[PDB]
DNA sequence: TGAAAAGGTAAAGGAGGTCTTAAGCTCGGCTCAATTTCTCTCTTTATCCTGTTAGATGGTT
């Protein structure tokens, strides 16, 4: 659990510089921010070690997703 | 006992309702093309879900 925390924890600085690019979409940057959070611990839970890379790597794929598919959902009233 | 005075009866005539036809119409049925619903298949999208491996790591107005 404790790892699983840590890990999540000490990327969130990654979560914020990737969720600053997207701050006039729809959604607030506290916003993006707490939806990447999602993505980032999505990326921790299917991170692999053996592939030998760089876990800012695999991470920004789901930080990524995470806050593209929240704008798809989340910023209009009218969602489309 | 005679005499009003009212009350009847039998007509003629009219008034009114009820019957009859020649002229004409229009109305429904019957057929019969000519089509709009319906109900299946048979697809075909509309919507949602998951994943993505160079490295990146504190805001703008």
Do not use: C, P
């Amino acid at each position: 659990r404790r790892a699983k925390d840590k890990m999540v924890q000490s990327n969130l600085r990654l979560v914020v510089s990737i969720a600053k690019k997207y701050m006039n979409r729809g959604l607030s940057f506290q916003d993006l921010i707490q939806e990447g959070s999602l993505g980032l611990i999505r990326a921790a839970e299917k991170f692999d070690h053996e592939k030998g890379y760089k876990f800012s790597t695999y991470a920004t794929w789901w930080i990524r997703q995470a806050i593209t598919r929240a704008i798809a959902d989340q910023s209009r009233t009218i969602r489309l």
